[PDB]
Write a protein that binds this ligand. Structure first.
Ligand code: MET
Ligand code: NA
Ligand SMILES: [Zn+2]
Length: 546
C-alpha cells in the first residue's frame, strides 16, 4: 500500500561519471528494479548538481557559460547512466525553475520560523579575482600543527577544525595571490535549534545503518553549529530572497533537487500522484536516499533539519555505501584505475559490472574491491559458464529435435516448485539490500539445476532407444529451472532478462509471473546471451585510462 520514492546522490556537473561512483547508482537501480518486480510502486529520480564555484571554474576552463556547461554534462551523465542500465524515471537539474521555487519556499519558511540569522563575518577575499573565498578555495598553514597546504575548514594532518582566517600565510587557489580580509554579511541556518530533534531522528529504527552510530555520536558530542548557507557574487546559483548579491551555497539547494526532480516527474507521468503525497508531513509514503558515506552529514543533519523547519516530511531512511577500490588500492590515473564510465562502456559489457557489484554488495557500509582478475573469473564462471549454459545445454535438444516446444507436462513439479519457493528468500534479500546473499542463493539454485541435468544425462538419453519423451521432459525441466534463475537475476541483469524474455517468449517477467510453469510452450532458437569477459578488453580499458 505504501508507495516509495528513491533517489541517488546528485553528481556535480563538473566532470564525468567514474567507475567508483557507479557502485551506488547500480546498487540503487538493482533495488528499484527488484522492488518493482515484487509489486511495489517505486518512483526513482536523480538530477545533476549544477551550482557552485567549482562548476564556474569548469565552464571557464571549457570556454563556455555555466548554463552550457551544465547542459553538456547532464547529457553526458544521462548517457553513461543509461549505458549501465541505471534507468531513472526522471533526470532533472538543481538549476531548474522547480528547484529555484522550492529553494525559496524552504528558505522563507525557515526564515519566518526563526531558523535564519544574518551577521557580518570576516572573510578572505581574492583581490586579483575580486571574489570572496570559501574554505575549499583557500590553502594555508594549520595553526595547530603548522602543516602546509591545508584547506580553510580543517587540517588533514592533525584533524583540527578552524575558520579559514586562522590559517597562517593563506593563499587563494583561484589565483595563488595572497588573500585579504574583508567583511561580508552571511546568512546562517540555525542547525543547533534541531539538536534534540536530530538526536532522536538519526536513531529512529531503520533511519541509518547501525555502523553510523559511532560517527553520529562523535558528531553530536562535537556539538552542532550554525551553518553558513550564503555565498557572495559572483556565484552560479540561486539568489537568496531579500538578500541582493547573495546566493544559496550549492549544498542548500542540492538535496532540494530530490524534491524538484520528483515534482517535475509527476507533472507528466503520474497524474494519480501529487507532491504532497510524498512531501507533506502527514505522508504515509516512503522516501529513501542512496548516498555515499562522504555525504552522510548533509543528509542526516542539514537536510532533515531544513525540511522539519519548513514543515515538510523527512526521509524514511538513508542507504549508505562505501567506496570502490581497484586491485586493492585507491583509484588512480597513474595505475589506470580511475576509469570513466564512458571508457568502461567502450570496452566491456556493463552487466559484467552490475553482476560483480551485486555479488559483493550488502547492507553494511563497507568498501568494495574490484579485483580485475577476479572480475573476469567470477563473471565468466557464474554467468557464461554456469547460468547461461543451463539454457544452452537444454535448448540444444528442444530446438533441434522437438520443434522448439517444451513438454506438455512438467516432469519434475516438486523440483521446479522448490525453485519457485526459493523466490521468497531471494526477494527478501533484494529488499534488505543483501545483494551478495541473493546472488549466492541464485547460484546455489544454478548448481542444483546443473546437478539435475547431470543426473538425467539428456545427451545419453538422446542416444538410447525410445527415450525421446524423456529427453524432452528433462530439457523442459532444465529450461523451467533456467527461467526461474533469469527472473531472479533480472534486477541485476536487465538486458539479459529482456533477451531471456525474447528467447522464452514471455511477456511477463516479474516475480509473480514465475509461478506459471512453462508447458506446451514454444521457445525461440537459442543464441548466446553473453560473451565472456575478455582480459584484453579489461586491459584496453585500463590502458585507455592512464
Ligand atoms: C544532494 S546529493 C549531492 C552530492 C554532491 N553533488 C556530491 O557529489 O557530493
Ligand atoms: Na553496502
Ligand atoms: Zn594541523
Amino acid at each position: 500500500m505504501r508507495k516509495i520514492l528513491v533517489t541517488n546522490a546528485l553528481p556535480y556537473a563538473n566532470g564525468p561519471i567514474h567507475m567508483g561512483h557507479l557502485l551506488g547508482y547500480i546498487q540503487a537501480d538493482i533495488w528499484v528494479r527488484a522492488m518493482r518486480a515484487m509489486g511495489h510502486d517505486v518512483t526513482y529520480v536523480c538530477a545533476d548538481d549544477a551550482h557552485g564555484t567549482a562548476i564556474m571554474l569548469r565552464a571557464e576552463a571549457n570556454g563556455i557559460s555555466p548554463e552550457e556547461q551544465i547542459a553538456n554534462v547532464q547529457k553526458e551523465h544521462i548517457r553513461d547512466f543509461d549505458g549501465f542500465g541505471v534507468h531513472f524515471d526522471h533526470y532533472d537539474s538543481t538549476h531548474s525553475d522547480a528547484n529555484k521555487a522550492r529553494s525559496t519556499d524552504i528558505y522563507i519558511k525557515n526564515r519566518e520560523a526563526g531558523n535564519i540569522a544574518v551577521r557580518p563575518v570576516t572573510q578572505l577575499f581574492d583581490p586579483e579575482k575580486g571574489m570572496f573565498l570559501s574554505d575549499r578555495f583557500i590553502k594555508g598553514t594549520c595553526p595547530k600543527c603548522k602543516s602546509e597546504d591545508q584547506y580553510g575548514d580543517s587540517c588533514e594532518v592533525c584533524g583540527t577544525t578552524y575558520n579559514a582566517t586562522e590559517l597562517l600565510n593563506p593563499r587563494s587557489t583561484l589565483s595563488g595571490a595572497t588573500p585579504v580580509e574583508k567583511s561580508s554579511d552571511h546568512y546562517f541556518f540555525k542547525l543547533p535549534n534541531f539538536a534534540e530533534y536530530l538526536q532522536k531522528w538519526t536513531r529512529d529504527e531503520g533511519r541509518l545503518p547501525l555502523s553510523i552510530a559511532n560517527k553520529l555520536d562523535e558528531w553530536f558530542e562535537a556539538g552542532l553549529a550554525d551553518w553558513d548557507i550564503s555565498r557572495d557574487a559572483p556565484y552560479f546559483g540561486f539568489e537568496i530572497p531579500d538578500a541582493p548579491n547573495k546566493y544559496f551555497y550549492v549544498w542548500v539547494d542540492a538535496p532540494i533537487g530530490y524534491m524538484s526532480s520528483f515534482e517535475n516527474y509527476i507533472k507528466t507521468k503520474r497524474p494519480d500522484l501529487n507532491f504532497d503525497d510524498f512531501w507533506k508531513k502527514d505522508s504515509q509514503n516512503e522516501v529513501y536516499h542512496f548516498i555515499g558515506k562522504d555525504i552522510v552529514y548533509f543528509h542526516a543533519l542539514f537536510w532533515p533539519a531544513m525540511l522539519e523547519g519548513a514543515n515538510y516530511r523527512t526521509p524514511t531512511g538513508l542507504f549508505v555505501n562505501g567506496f570502490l577500490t581497484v586491485n586493492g588500492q585507491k583509484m588512480s590515473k597513474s595505475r589506470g584505475t580511475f576509469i570513466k564510465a564512458e571508457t568502461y562502456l567502450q570496452h566491456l559489457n556493463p552487466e559484467y559490472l552490475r553482476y560483480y557489484f551485486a555479488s559483493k554488495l550488502s547492507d553494511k557500509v563497507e568498501d568494495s574491491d574490484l579485483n580485475l582478475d577476479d572480475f573476469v573469473q567470477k563473471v565468466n564462471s557464474d554467468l557464461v559458464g554456469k547460468v547461461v549454459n543451463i539454457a544452452s545445454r537444454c535448448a540444444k535438444f528442444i530446438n533441434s529435435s522437438f520443434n522448439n516446444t517444451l513438454s506438455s507436462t512438467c516432469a519434475e513439479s516438486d523440483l521446479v516448485q522448490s525453485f519457485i519457493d526459493a523466490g521468497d528468500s531471494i526477494a527478501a534479500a533484494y529488499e534488505a539490500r543483501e545483494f551478495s546473499t541473493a546472488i549466492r542463493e541464485i547460484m546455489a539454485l544454478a548448481d542444483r539445476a546443473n546437478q539435475y541435468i547431470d543426473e538425467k544425462k539428456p545427451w545419453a538419453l538422446a542416444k538410447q532407444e525410445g527415450q525421446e519423451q524423456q529427453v524432452l521432459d528433462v530439457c523442459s525441466v532444465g529450461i523451467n529451472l533456467f527461467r526461474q534463475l533469469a527472473v531472479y537475476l533480472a534486477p541485476v541483469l536487465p538486458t539479459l532478462a529482456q533477451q531471456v524474455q525474447d528467447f522464452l517468449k514471455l511477456e511477463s517477467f516479474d516475480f509473480e509471473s514465475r509461478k506459471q510453469i512453462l508447458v506446451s510452450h514454444e521457445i525461440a532458437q537459442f543464441q548466446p546471451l553473453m560473451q565472456r569477459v575478455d582480459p584484453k578488453a579489461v586491459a584496453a580499458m585500463v590502458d585507455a585510462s592512464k
